[PDB]
Assembly symmetry: D2
Homo-oligomer: 338 residues x 4
């Protein structure tokens, strides 16, 4: 039987996730049955079909009326309430809530979905506090079916952690620094406007904007051996999607760039197939739009100095690739619902 | 005895207005004494000083504490309440509110400032109805001191209406179409997101976005004889400030491009000095950042066909030039208080 | 027996044209057999496959060696000589040259291809004089096989001329002004640099840039009755592809917006099918990437004042849609070889 | 007596340099007397006055005729020849050539200026081959007056080397990785077009573009102790000016972020005053336009892991700050002309 899903927050990730599910609907243990959003179903149907980044959805017809979005005849019920406690999850028989609003990342916030009637909550962001965090391909097999609130970490964590895991098991990471040169996101301001983060306050398509990255802390949650050994920052720049992370590690076992690349290549073919992609091509960010991998190693940029200082560089589609992983984590939870 | 001014909404217009006043406060009848905004004074002082468009504010020191923003020893008290009826306008002795939030453009909405204790309200946008509308240099001398709620119209109206007035008196405008190729504004979305306007919902730095312009209706409000005779649209494009309006008019007196430019040039040196600037230079939008005129006629682009089809093109700094006009209108109101 | 085609200048138009032909070569009288360009085949094959605007070419494999580009087993010989008189057109048996460099738009310049051995030349731009100019769907059926050098006009001409033809036959165009809000092109400068046009010299991704449009003169070449009756300008803006043209016409037969849209809609379903698309959707420039029509009327923007002042607005993919028309014109030439 | 200067290549650096000299002309041992460029004096006068990045030059009047650019009455002779061997350096009595074309970075290329009559050549880029390289504040005091061709390195080298010098003398750098997130430059393509570097070929304002950085090699030329111990890459992003370099070093003496910041702060006040600026402010790239320092340490982003892995982040205005340093190096050469 299907696990019935509701999306809370039909934004960039909510809509990417919906389009991921629509293209994989023939193999899914999931049925998306409901949406809660600040907007209305006609507005949300329009944004679902006409996407500046993904192009026009062509696989099936998208329409809407007062109460539902329809995608190839599949009816998705729509509601509009900013307080999750008031949501009709009990009545709709909602099993799993995809929490993609950005404002309910704490256990107390996400739990409002549980008291409204949902069984589990999957937060599409690092969790605030005591929330189990998962990266598919790194630690999702340690998922415990008894856990009712989980986090899928961040886009940068999903790109960096699979690579860090491979490098750590091969060379032993002792300390590591990360910088992600990162597309702007809706958390930033179009023009200078108030924000809790004084740099994210600034005109996003006009500036290089230093800010924090969830990966600085979250990679050590999904690779517990490395807790407290990694740190780094983000630089937001004026592209609308696709990001690249630079990672510099102090390693225990001496190596060279050829060996580093070969270890990641072998992983991308076996243990990390479909999570890591290995590329020797001389591409740029536009070329990785729509890529399904969590991280694409840019093998031409790998450098090693003095044996023990390793630099790798990996691309990721922070909207679509991350959403593919949200879907993967939800399918895993559906398989181990017990 | 100064007119005491509060700013409601310390946004792009609110802060451009503040920097305009700070540069002109030697010959001013206004004293900015308070600010209401969704944010705190330390954040707002940071944004007042560091502006991606205007650059770093040079003239005076800008600091803040929990209570005030300080601009070269001048203290501006701050408060943060979304409901204008709660504002301390009586206790602060506020005379005039600059209503720059974009959300109180109806008479009942702006009148909340009067029940809080202010005497008059100047809305930095077209009013939603039954609110007198003024354009400095076009009809502001019809301002009547008995009007306690007024509108300064929109940026496009302030650029187009001076030129329309000049053209109408010289040639007789029978009909006219406008299109402004317009920088994006905070009303638009950084990435595709819900909006009451399905095109303003779309990623603003990625797209040419057709939408409405206030000038289409408001020019005929400040030039009553042209009521119903003008129409047009806006195309929002991926620049963060400075816009250009294209106006095609059906006129009664047959003319040619050279005479049209002579008529506007003569006016820019006399009746419209400081409102219309006449330019024969081959410049682009960046060169007009910070220009004080309401309208810069690009004379090289003027064209006339068959005597009666006239096309003119004018630049405007929609943030700074408009804010200069807000200040001019507030000074005029302060001069005609009773 | 195919018409053997070489491309001179493997640029944006040259490569869009190639990808157009590759997608249509099943029902084609053309065979692209050669390329001349300033660059080498390995670089040009890379750019043919990896396109920041069109995305990664999907249909066939693209490879290269020192001598050729290979597109799914079809070999395209490559050469690199800036002087067309030296090209191996005789030895390669070239029939038709697609002249897409932008530097041989005069008859003497394009005729260098004939002395190198080609039989006919199709210039992907307005000609510099005494070169017949065609717009598919407007006057291409007047093409005479005796003409060995022809012009496909410009992107803006191909968008505006079909709509002008429809409007002129229905209402009688007396005069008309155009403004295209136009994506930047390779002719412009990335950062301020010398140019024969002092505004195209200015940083293209930073500025709104007024400049000339070929449509101003060329529409009257493909619709001779309108010679001298039309004029206008372009505003280049910081988007990399897709443009929109705004056309205000003085017409003889009084009309209203609803009738104007009905006249264009009826034509888009009959005489202009596949050239004009009629759209009542609320879309933005990104949604028209890859559209095959020459002109997409945005019906919601149509306006009429006083019966005789008509405004219409039409989208066009200036790279891809124009290249589809280049291909259409080359097919037509191939069909009428003698 | 003055050292007479000619600029070869009146581009972004050539014109920034000219404007640097104009603002410091009251203390200079240099007289700019000549310009060679691909363009004409009227075009170059226009670009000198109207700059998309620097704004309109206001300090003095800029005009031109057929032969000269005039800047506040100072006449600069203009010539236009792509081959330096043909330039009139002998006749004009040119002492020093500022070589800013980007195409004469080898000794054999730059020497053509010497055979045309110039005494010395200062290349505004890393030199190709056997050319002494200087960073002001790092090694310019080792300049030998007998050297007739010198290099000022690159923008990134001038930002990174002063910091590396400070950190090395304080903590002992053993190995180090750099990534500069860098504004696009005129070497990149506005839209996808052929380039010797397949990534710089791609649309610059649309992409994150990995490429090489001159600093990877040049920092070890100006700090000879570190030759072969540093490496790194550049990521070009869609901003038109201002860059930021991230530097991760393995150091010998254990430290912490507080100490790293304090060492650079002390340097910025003493040995590196005017080369390094120390900032604790939460700014973004737009805020560093026009900054005169070679590097602005962003102190809030400094991190240290495990004692010996240090990360620092520094801003730089790659056009204006680098040009200030070109001017400084030219003044130094003028002081030690002997
Ligand atoms: N965009 C990315 O690259 C990315 C990648 C990984 C994770 N994330 C995370 O996913 C979450 C969503 O990010 P996004 O980029 O989609 O943002 P977004 O702003 O596009 O989406 C948020 C959506 O939630 C809606 N919303 C806001 N408050 C609500 C409430 N109280 N109730 C219901 N709906 C509400 C908004 O209207 C919007 O549709 C954030 O936590 C973000 O950190 C984003
Ligand atoms: N930006 C322009 O070019 C321009 C030109 C002319 C007129 N306008 C008009 O000026 C007004 C403001 O535009 P802007 O571009 O400065 O927008 P903005 O979003 O930059 O500024 C609005 C400010 O009001 C604050 N705010 C919102 N709701 C509030 C409330 N209930 N109480 C207090 N503060 C609140 C916001 O936090 C923000 O600081 C709008 O009416 C707009 O149409 C804008
Ligand atoms: N880009 C558009 O939207 C568009 C639309 C319609 C028409 N056009 C016209 O198409 C033509 C090409 O425009 P584009 O945008 O593709 O420009 P582009 O700069 O991308 O392409 C020109 C190509 O020609 C090559 N080239 C230059 N000189 C050459 C020579 N002497 N010999 C061989 N190759 C040479 C260049 O390297 C480049 O590959 C121009 O005439 C332009 O006006 C462009
Ligand atoms: N822009 C930066 O951030 C930056 C910073 C440091 C160093 N540089 C270096 O400075 C040099 C110039 O770079 P730019 O950004 O000013 O490039 P640019 O393209 O703006 O300037 C080059 C100038 O030289 C002219 N030119 C080209 N070939 C010529 C020839 N044979 N003879 C005479 N003039 C010729 C061009 O017309 C142009 O005006 C390059 O070597 C670059 O690496 C650039
Ligand atoms: Mg007439
Ligand atoms: Mg009429």
């Amino acid at each position: 039987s299907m696990v019935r899903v509701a999306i809370n927050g039909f934004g960039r990730i909510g809509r990417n996730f919906m389009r991921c599910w629509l293209q994989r609907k023939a193999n899914s243990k999931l049925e998306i049955v409901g949406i809660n959003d600040t907007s209305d179903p006609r507005t949300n149907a329009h944004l679902l079909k006409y996407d500046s980044m993904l192009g026009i959805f062509q696989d099936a017809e998208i329409t809407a009326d007062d109460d539902c979005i329809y995608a190839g005849g599949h009816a998705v019920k729509c509601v509009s309430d900013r307080n999750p406690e008031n949501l009709p999850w009990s009545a709709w028989g909602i099993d799993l809530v995809i929490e993609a609003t950005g404002v309910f990342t704490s256990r107390e916030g996400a739990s409002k979905h549980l008291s409204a009637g949902a069984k589990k909550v999957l937060i599409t962001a690092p969790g605030k506090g005591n929330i189990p965090t998962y990266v598919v391909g790194v630690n999702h097999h340690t998922y415990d079916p008894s856990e009712d609130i989980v986090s899928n970490a961040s886009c940068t964590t999903n790109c960096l952690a699979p690579i860090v895991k491979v490098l750590h098991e091969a060379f032993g990471i002792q300390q590591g620094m990360m910088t992600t040169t990162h597309s702007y996101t809706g958390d930033q301001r179009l023009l200078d406007a108030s924000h809790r983060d004084l740099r994210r306050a600034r005109a996003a398509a006009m500036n290089i904007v230093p800010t924090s990255t969830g990966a600085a802390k979250a990679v050590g949650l999904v690779i517990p051996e490395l807790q407290g050994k990694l740190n780094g920052i983000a630089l937001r720049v004026p592209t609308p999607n696709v990001s690249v992370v630079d990672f510099v590690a102090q390693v225990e076992k001496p190596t060279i760039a050829e060996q580093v690349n070969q270890v990641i290549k072998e992983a991308s073919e076996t243990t990390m197939k479909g999570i890591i992609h290995y590329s020797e091509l001389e591409l740029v960010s536009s070329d990785y739009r729509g890529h399904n991998a969590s991280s694409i190693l840019d093998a031409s940029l790998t450098m090693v100095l003095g044996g023990n200082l390793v630099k790798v560089v990996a691309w990721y589609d922070n909207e679509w690739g991350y959403s593919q992983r949200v879907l993967d984590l939800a399918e895993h939870m559906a398989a181990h619902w017990a």
